[PDB]
Design a binder for this molecule. Sequence first.
Ligand code: CLA
Ligand code: CLA
Ligand code: CLA
Ligand code: CLA
Ligand code: CLA
Ligand SMILES: CCCCCCCCCCCCCCCC(=O)OC[C@H](COP(=O)(O)OC[C@@H](O)CO)OC(=O)CCCCCCCCCCCCCCC
Ligand SMILES: CC1=C(/C=C/C(C)=C/C=C/C(C)=C\C=C\C=C(C)\C=C\C=C(C)\C=C\C2=C[C@H](C)[C@H](O)CC2(C)C)C(C)(C)C[C@@H](O)C1
Ligand code: SF4
Ligand code: SF4
Lengths: 740, 69, 40, 139, 31, 40, 142, 73, 80
Amino acid sequence: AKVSVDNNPVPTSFEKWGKPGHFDRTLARGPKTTTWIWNLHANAHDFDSQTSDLEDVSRKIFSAHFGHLAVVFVWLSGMYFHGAKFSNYEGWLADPTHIKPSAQVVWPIVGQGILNGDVGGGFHGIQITSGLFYLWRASGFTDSYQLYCTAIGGLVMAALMLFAGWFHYHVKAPKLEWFQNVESMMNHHLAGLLGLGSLGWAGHQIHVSMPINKLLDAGVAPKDIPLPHEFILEPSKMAELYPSFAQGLTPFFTLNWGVYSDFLTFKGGLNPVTGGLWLSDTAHHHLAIAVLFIIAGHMYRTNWGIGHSMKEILEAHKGPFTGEGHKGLYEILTTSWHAQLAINLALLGSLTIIVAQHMYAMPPYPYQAIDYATQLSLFTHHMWIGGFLIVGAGAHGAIFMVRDYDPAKNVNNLLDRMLRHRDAIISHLNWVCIFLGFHSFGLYIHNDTMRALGRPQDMFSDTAIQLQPIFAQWVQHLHTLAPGATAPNALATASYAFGGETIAVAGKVAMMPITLGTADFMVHHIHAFTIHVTALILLKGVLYARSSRLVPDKANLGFRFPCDGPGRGGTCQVSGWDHVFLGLFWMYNSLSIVIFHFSWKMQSDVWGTVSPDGSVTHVTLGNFAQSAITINGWLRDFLWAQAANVINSYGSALSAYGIMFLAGHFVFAFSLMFLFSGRGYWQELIESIVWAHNKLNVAPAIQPRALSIIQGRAVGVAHYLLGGIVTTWAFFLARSLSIG
Amino acid sequence: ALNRGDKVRIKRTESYWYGDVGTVASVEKSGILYPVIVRFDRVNYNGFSGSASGVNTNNFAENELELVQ
Amino acid sequence: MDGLKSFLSTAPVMIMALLTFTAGILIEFNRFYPDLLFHP
Amino acid sequence: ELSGQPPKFGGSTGGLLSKANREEKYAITWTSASEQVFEMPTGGAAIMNEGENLLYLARKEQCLALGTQLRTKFKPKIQDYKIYRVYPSGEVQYLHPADGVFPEKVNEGREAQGTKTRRIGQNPEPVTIKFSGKAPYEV
Amino acid sequence: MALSDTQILAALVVALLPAFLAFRLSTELYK
Amino acid sequence: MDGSYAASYLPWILIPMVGWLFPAVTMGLLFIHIESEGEG
Amino acid sequence: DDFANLTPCSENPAYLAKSKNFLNTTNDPNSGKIRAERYASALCGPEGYPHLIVDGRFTHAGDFLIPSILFLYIAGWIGWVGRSYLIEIRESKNPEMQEVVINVPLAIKKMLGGFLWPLAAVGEYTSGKLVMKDSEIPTSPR
Amino acid sequence: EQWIKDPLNIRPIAHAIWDPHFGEGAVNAFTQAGASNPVNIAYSGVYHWFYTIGMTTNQELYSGAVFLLVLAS
Amino acid sequence: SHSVKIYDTCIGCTQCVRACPLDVLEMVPWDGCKAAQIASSPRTEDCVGCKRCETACPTDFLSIRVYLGAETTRSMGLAY
Ligand code: CLA
Ligand code: CLA
Ligand code: CLA
Ligand code: CLA
Ligand code: CLA
Ligand SMILES: CCCCCCCCCCCCCCCC(=O)OC[C@H](COP(=O)(O)OC[C@@H](O)CO)OC(=O)CCCCCCCCCCCCCCC
Ligand SMILES: CC1=C(/C=C/C(C)=C/C=C/C(C)=C\C=C\C=C(C)\C=C\C=C(C)\C=C\C2=C[C@H](C)[C@H](O)CC2(C)C)C(C)(C)C[C@@H](O)C1
Ligand code: SF4
Ligand code: SF4
């Protein structure tokens, strides 16, 4: 066993609760100005700066992660309880195509009971767009008692997580050697968490979800369907639904796997009844990835000499152009938490971006594709989460570079070589950013000017100069031919976005081919430009955090400092924190353009109503192709046109959205107080106001101070992003709930 | 004249405590041209951007202080 | 415990407790007597 | 004139530019007690060799940053570094330390410069010195 | 009635005088 | 680009000078003047 | 003859037409009828919504004067208790610590004594220690 | 001179348009107010001012322009 | 170049000299303070104007003041 712990390192007492700022030496002394408050709420969860012992920092990180797990468990239990008690899930289950989901009920106090709109079936409540009902239907939920039991279990798990944090910090704290068993951690977390989780979910689906969903799709009422344990207790029903279940587990151990083909298929595509993925396809999928992850385990040497070593692999992959190669990286990623945070944040953010872009093309949940509001909400939500996580990676990497980077251990290794040609990287990246922005946004402005001048034949359109995405069309053609040709055992395409027939449920298009033209070319290259610019900002922050030709000692100044001074012409916003602050806005811009493109293209070319004849009428008709090529088209046919549903929301059940819409437009503007101004003006104003309060002998002991420069920038960016995102959220929700 | 424990009002006209009251922490008896040391309950703006405290002590000449006590 | 009492007496806890007290007062009054534009 | 083996460096894009051969450059020399790794002010890590060292930089601030790193981040503290200014013609001007004693500690024989015999609040009003090429602090 | 080409040309010739005067004034002010 | 006012040929020649010739000549003269080293 | 453009809501056709469909603010089923009754005595414009007249006249004292007195009393209470607590804690040894950690006993003692804030304020002004002199306040350079 | 005959139904014209970057659609759109070429529509309200102060003919406007040239000189 | 002035309120704590990154300041003997030393700015043509010396000064108002003036290559702190 590699376990090593320390018993009762920190006593459990309430005294330090009464002394805020205890962690910091500069704050535990007592407040003299108001800044002491803002520091207290800012340096709290920065354990690295509080103490120099790495083991204590790791222990604190472990227990804090336990706390976040407990909070998430409480959130999940609350979701299940509010879906079990204040929701029409049981009503929606019987009539899923005629009842809107709803799980929030509003007390009537000051007229907000108007928010309790008619969601169908005689139920009054706020319509939900999270898609929890479809997930619950796919999971096999049929009664509210099961949801209530799930909520109770979630609360119990949250309490257990809290106790685990208390135990593993205040009682039995792990040792540093325990935390650095990266091989053992990786093995247990690839095989024991991802592989075992996938195996358990595949077992749940096969033994619970598929029978219930098969009976539900046939037309059986929810109350008639047998409870999930009855399938296990009496396998006769399971054999009736799936004949191969009569064979038992014998073919599995004799490799006669083909007999299981009926409930482990490779169909691909969408289920016609529900519009979601086939549950047999998902079963074989999660089973396959479970097997793959368990096999990916058993790879790193832990205790029996049988396995690879991460350090050997890293130090063995070196070449001519890279000097020492991947040498010293193992010590970097086993001694600094910030580098691990940066890598994990970047990969996780990209992962949620992938989730957002893949969950809409192949909708996995029943009746989710036809609920356009849920589709748009899920896409945009996980898109924003991914963007924020990527920016956080860009931030905490610079934090690592400022603090945990040591030149002694990095000689001619990849990190040093990166630090050597950083000027070339930044210059070439800046050039590519300028080129992308120029040519793309100039196509846009050129189209605007040509349209305004009455020369539509000189534009960049499908009728005019084409600019067709030939490569994307070619890959779409290849993926459309894949079933039978390059994936012979597949029945249909991975998704109908590439091509194929139009899958439509309840007279509403679930998925139809998404054609790419001139507008798609322009928007995709605009996306590339914005992403490369955000990457440029964050990369300049990371690479130049240590020093630069302007300031050669920024590392000693710290990671979060406002400036070096008015000298050298002016040295404002030179810290890495300032680079993060600047990159947040560009992430917002890029993600806003991405979600706008998604929404408009989805409304104009896919979503809509299908007639009995077969004709498809789209939400905004085919106006994306001929309008999204000019900025005026984006302003008139997207913002002005589709904002009608949010500006005319007053007096109805959607009024809240309208209110929130205006709320966003306020906070954004409010943020311009802090971004456009500085703190000396506010300090002088506070001096005058302090004189006023002093004349009446009501001056406070804690001397008021204007916010710091860094705090001012942070407040500005926070309120700005909040206002913009809330505006977009209200607009999207109103539009998507008002388009049927 | 000004001794320990003397509550005095500041008349430097540019210090942070002009018109405020402080107490005489020490007086140095030599040719020093700002010999009086005065400490204050309030702290000034001294410190880098983000610092949680200032300075609560300063040196003054005898002529720019008015005894109150 | 003395530490728990001191923690409960800190600024955020007092401000939030007073805010919930005032909000409850206002909400209950508006429930039992709504739509008061003026003293009639 | 200026002697010392350059530290072993792989070369970086952050080094000198045309200003070095057009306007001036700066040189820093120090004695190292052991060949050990230090940090380039221009980006990267290089090993300095036992004995004399000599490094060319583009700015005086970079040279003084390197001197600070030498003085602070090494247990055998390097207090003997010297910073010169090298002109394109060939003239070398000794810059730091001025008299061989660090400016932090007071040394006799220095001359007061920029010292005013009044306090900041006693500066003349601008209106009394306007239309003359002077500033209140200049008086 | 609308103007004639001679009127426009005469207006240009007349405006040629304030141009020369403005050039002189600008040179005088620069000095 | 074609007009019915008296002496309609004037904008055919006046606008280019105000558009290209005058801006270019002014650019050149100012660039030479602001960059002329010495003598002040 | 005052407010020839404003008519009583009891006769304004727009108000009577729109008062039938008044929404229920609370769970009480006849809250809208109560609101229509209570607002029928106001002065409605051509669009049928009540208008508040604030010029000092006592016939419309309910619009401003009574809420003004109520708010002034409450705000004076709050300000007086805050100022008294501040001045009280200013004589202790850690006035700043008691600013962030509220002395709940003393806090509530000052909380309950604020209903006589006008008498205390006038006594404070007459005693001369409500307002400090200009020469005893720190001031910025001119 | 045409505007004064019907100030309530004729748009005053500010200046003529000469843009080689124009297209056919813009040329057709900007030929307004009874003009024979692309023109702008004045919104500074100088036509009403000139009418009120007594200017009624084009030659009066021309004489005023020349006199102002002389005054500026 | 920028100007650096030291006034007679200096207490000779030498913090300004330590804080200067371009070696513009110096400590010279004096008699007005207990430490008997005052700051000086002989090498003022190398000053960039970072105001670190002003930040380091602990007096009620800065006994060392920096007035930004004419800008040279050194003052801008340019490497090209
Ligand atoms: C992410 C978690 C989450 C969220 C956002 C919500 C949100 C909501 N719930 Mg809910 N709930 C959750 C989890 C959650 N719930 C869980 C886990 C359970 C199971 C226990 C419930 C059980 C539940 C019930 C039974 C009801 C709600 C209701 C509501 C709605 C009314 C808000 C409310 O209760 O405030 C009400 C107002 C207050 C709680 C204010 C009281 C004063 C507060 C607590 C001040 C806190 C400090 C206080 C002074 C104590 C001092 C502590 C100090 C020492 C730290 C609202 C939409 C109600 C609803 O929708 O009815 C239609 C309702 O009846 N919830
Ligand atoms: C099979 C073994 C196993 C499993 C399942 C996990 C799982 C986890 N580890 Mg982990 N770990 C392991 C072995 C394992 N570890 C070993 C051997 C080491 C030492 C080398 C570590 C060292 C380690 C560190 C240092 C950290 C983690 C953390 C985490 C959590 C990351 C958050 C996450 O994935 O969200 C997904 C969350 C869930 C799926 C909820 C799971 C809730 C409980 C804890 C799972 C219990 C499952 C258990 C097998 C019983 C279920 C069986 C049956 C009842 C069905 C995750 C719960 C992080 C953390 O703090 O989290 C606490 C962290 O920082 N691990
Ligand atoms: C896994 C996620 C994760 C983790 C564990 C950390 C961990 C840490 N970060 Mg990091 N960070 C992350 C993600 C993460 N970060 C992301 C995604 C970003 C990009 C936005 C950043 C950006 C960032 C910066 C810029 C800084 C840190 C810092 C820190 C350190 C602690 C100080 C701190 O932020 O606490 C204090 C936290 C706060 C004061 C947050 C409170 C204010 C938030 C923003 C309000 C949120 C409002 C909410 C969204 C909506 C409310 C609406 C309202 C009406 C109710 C610590 C190492 C700091 C550091 O230098 O440490 C070394 C630092 O300066 N982080
Ligand atoms: C400042 C007043 C003024 C302004 C803004 C304009 C504006 C215009 N005139 Mg015009 N013009 C003016 C006075 C003015 N005029 C006067 C007083 C005369 C009589 C000599 C003319 C005679 C004239 C002719 C004959 C023609 C124009 C034309 C034009 C148009 C083409 C652009 C241009 O000026 O270059 C061309 C015009 C000139 C170079 C005329 C010379 C400019 C005047 C005489 C001097 C103004 C100097 C000015 C005050 C400098 C200010 C400096 C300041 C920017 C710092 C444009 C709408 C053309 C047109 O109709 O195109 C559709 C055209 O063919 N103008
Ligand atoms: C490529 C785009 C483009 C270009 C180049 C032009 C070019 C022109 N248009 Mg135009 N237009 C366009 C698109 C374009 N248009 C579009 C899309 C529309 C909408 C349909 C219009 C609608 C339109 C109308 C309605 C009118 C024009 C007019 C004009 C002409 C004005 C003459 C001029 O600029 O001199 C004057 C130059 C200036 C005033 C310079 C101002 C710009 C600088 C930056 C200001 C100076 C700052 C500083 C002091 C500079 C110092 C000096 C410098 C040398 C250093 C010119 C030929 C006018 C015209 O024909 O009358 C002659 C006119 O009435 N256009
Ligand atoms: C697919 C079509 C659409 C995308 C087309 C864009 C391709 C543009 C450039 C070609 C990629 C060439 C990679 C070869 C290069 C390569 O493989 O290098 C590998 C080489 C390392 O070789 P060694 O064998 O020494 O490496 C040992 C390593 O294992 C390290 O331990 O690295 C270098 O030589 C330095 C890299 C210079 C890299 C120059 C920067 C290029 C930045 C732009 C790349 C943009 C790609 C964007 C789209 C992905
Ligand atoms: C005592 C006290 C304090 C301090 C209070 C102080 C120091 C107050 C000082 C006030 C001063 C110096 C001046 C005040 C001036 C007030 C004026 C000018 C009032 C004017 C009123 C008018 C014009 C009435 C107007 C119309 C009156 C009428 C009744 C209708 O509506 C119509 C309408 C609105 C026109 C605090 C703040 C420290 C704490 C508090 O709790 C108590
Ligand atoms: S401003 Fe900066 S460079 Fe100039 S003297 Fe002060 S510390 Fe030195
Ligand atoms: S920091 Fe101020 S007080 Fe200290 S030596 Fe420098 S000028 Fe004098």
